[PDB]
Amino acid sequence: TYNNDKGLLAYIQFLASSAQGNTDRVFDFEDALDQTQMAQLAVDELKKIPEVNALFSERWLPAPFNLDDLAKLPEGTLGHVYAREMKARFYKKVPVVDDISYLKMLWRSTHDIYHVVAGFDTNVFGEIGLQAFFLAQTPIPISVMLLSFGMVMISLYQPTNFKALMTEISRGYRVGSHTPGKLIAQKWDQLWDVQVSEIRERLGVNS
Amino acid sequence: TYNNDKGLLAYIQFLASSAQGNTDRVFDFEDALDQTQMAQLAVDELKKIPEVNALFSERWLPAPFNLDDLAKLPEGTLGHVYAREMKARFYKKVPVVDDISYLKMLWRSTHDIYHVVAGFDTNVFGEIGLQAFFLAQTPIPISVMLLSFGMVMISLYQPTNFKALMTEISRGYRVGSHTPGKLIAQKWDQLWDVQVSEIRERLGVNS
Amino acid sequence: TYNNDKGLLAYIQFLASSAQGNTDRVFDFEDALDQTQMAQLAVDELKKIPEVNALFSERWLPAPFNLDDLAKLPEGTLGHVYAREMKARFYKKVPVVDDISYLKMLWRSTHDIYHVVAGFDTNVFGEIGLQAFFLAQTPIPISVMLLSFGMVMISLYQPTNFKALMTEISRGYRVGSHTPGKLIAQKWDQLWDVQVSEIRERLGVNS
Amino acid sequence: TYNNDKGLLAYIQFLASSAQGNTDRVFDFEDALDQTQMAQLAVDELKKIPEVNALFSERWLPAPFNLDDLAKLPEGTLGHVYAREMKARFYKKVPVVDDISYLKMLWRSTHDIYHVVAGFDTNVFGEIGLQAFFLAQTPIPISVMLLSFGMVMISLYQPTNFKALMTEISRGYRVGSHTPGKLIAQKWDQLWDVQVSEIRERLGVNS
Secondary structure (H helix, E strand, C coil), rough: CCCHHHHHHHHHHHHHCCCHHHHHHCCCHHHHCCCCHHHHHHHHHHHCCCCHHHHHHHHCCCCCHHHHHCCCCCCCEHHHHHHHHHCCCCCCCCCCHHHHHHHHHHHHHHHHHHHHCCCCCCCCHHHHHHHHHHHHHHCCHHHHHHHHHHHHHHHHCCHHHHHHHCCCCCCCCCCCCCCCCCCCCHHHHHHCCCCHHHHHHHHCCCC | CCCCCCHHHHHHHHHHHHHHHHHHHHHHHHHHHHHHHHHHHHHHHHCCCHHHHHHHCCCCCCCCCCCCHCCCCCEEEHHHHHHHHHHHHCCCCCCCHHHHHHHHHHHHHHHHHHHHHCCCCCCHHHHHHHHHHHHHHCCHHHHCCCCCCCHHHHHHCCHHHHHHHHHHHHHHHHHHHCCCCCCCCHHHHHHHCCEEHHHHHHHHHCC | CCHHHHHHHHHHHHHHHHCCCHHHHHHHHHHHHCCHHHHHHHHHHHCCCHHHHHHHCCCCCHHHCCCHHCCCCCCEEEEHHHHHHHHHHHCCCCCCCCCCHHHHHHHHHHHHHHHHHHCCCHHHHHHHHHHHHHHHHHHCCHHHHHHHHHHHHHHHCCCHHHHHHHHHHHHHHHHHHHHCCCCCCCHHHHCCCEEEEHHHHCCCCCC | CCCCHHHHHHHHHHHHHHHHHHHHHHHHEEECCCCHHHHHHHHHCCCCCCCHHHHHCCCCCCCCCHHHHHCCCCCCEHHHHHHHHHHHHHCCCCCCCHHHHHHHHHHHHHHHHHHHHCCCCCCCHHHHHHHHHHHHCCCHHHHHHHHHHHHHHHHHCCCCHHHHHHHHHHHHHHHHCCCCCCCCCCCHHCCCCCCCHHHHHHHCCCC
């Protein structure tokens, strides 16, 4: 019923293209994983968590925001932190037709907020660190693929930075494993005016 | 000075062949990684640990053993445990010409003993668990490649067993990170007559 | 001095992506072949034919045209035929910095004219047939890659059309081998007002 | 009903391994193509030629021979020529269970004789030329794959020999297209005592 071999072909494509813009390569890969068994299983397991199943039922997606208005919010709030680093540094839209296309949209609309709450950098290691945190909480295909990819590309092309990469991966997974409050379960558009330290405390980043 | 692109080609070869005996596929892959920068770096970092550098200097390799004589040793000894499970279930030999060909031989001669001391099964998950333990202690290219491979092949082809795979990977890395006594640093041929619990205690598997 | 392994990675990327827009995939591939030895050798061999070496000296590229003005030319002329089928059915620009970036631009600016003079369809088989005609005359890396790709993708995914593909490939090569007048050597912008039958006669398509 | 994606994975495996014994790599690849649609279609099309369909009915395979006894035959006979060059320079056996396993065995048992009758060298280019002759007569998946592979590996890794490769490929295809007597249709074990010139005349190599 599922074409997993096309998932492997998509991963081989991803590894090979990266050995030669960069934002669209991940979207093309993500799309190729929709046909796999892990795509359906991820949806089946997320729908087992009540607050996540509610978002699937509602088809919840964050309200549009103006970066300039977010920047005008208090000093340590989610809005201010996100906007300040967006100006210092938006995705491929798909029609929501089923559970898989919904999860894809929920992920794309919200995942760039994750690293600010989780406490990871916008750099390569920070992004691999964040994936390890997500995988520890709620495993989805792209997170598994991006972790393996990360490990392979750093050890092959920049092995002098492998220890650093493993330090972020282990920290990410460890912290994510001890965070009961799932990132994916949050209605982010309602947290722009809330302190980042307060959000971390609500999710129980320490715990 | 290093051909890393051939390392990526070797990994793509490995992923693709596995999607179709199995022992020789890993040896061919291992050999293809000798040309990479990570191969040299692994040697450079291992030689920084005194007891490991001594084995490189000596060109230490384990003495030949007769499985029947090992089985005749006491109940809980390394020899007895290894032999009992070998009979219930030997590799590609290369001439030792340099540091990389030495490490390859040391690895091949001894790595099948590792899982009995580390406490991992001979199955697929047990082997991926063991790699995570080794990577936590002394990172070498094959261990990184086999971890990524594991993660990708299970999530693509048997995703219903991904949680189980992550459970072994995390346990492996966690235990390995808390084991000061390096597996690679041991003169295994001198431990056949020593209790497994005693070896685990010497290496400080708990710590 | 050349990275050929990256050429193989580009081909693997191309095959794998083509097993899942389509115009940019060929450009990305073409670009990845610039680093190979065949890229330089193709330039070295083309520069051995005087008429071609003349365009390399001038860094000749076709003058801009308005499709509506070309359509207004007499019945059987190159301009009229091209425009009529363009309306019934433009590329990635690169700065001309050397002979490889030059040949890439010459190819992209002019190759869509080739099929009208050569007599091949705009469809998949017509394009693979045209590449066979081009490889018979003046071999360049993309033609070789596009031919192999063609053969592999049809035999793997649509084998019921393999006989038809081999009919276009052999016709293309045969006709191209018997055409002394090289396509690549022509200053196309000077032939818009010339009959297609006259151009075919000048190039000696029969011969 | 067929897994074509596994055929593509097998080709990617083959290309990548060939960028680093060599006899078994082709057999593993050949085996991976049995699951494709082209495998069945090749059998369906071969069984449409009566002389071939006769061998499919008998599941004909050549009788065993002693190389020393073949060498003792007259000067220009098939036996003598084959044996003389075998001594100057045998395969993976599979149980014949269906038409695909049959064609695989017929191919492996007899294909080394082909080059002596067809007039191609035992070298790399001679083998690629022979496959072109075979594809012109009776197309089977391995020939298509071996042709594409050939073209890609020479243009990527030894482009200075591409002209020579295209000379053998076009000669092979041209000669094969003009040979009515199919190689695959011959009961070779009955021709050991027949002159090579006589066999070429019977098959109509010129025609």
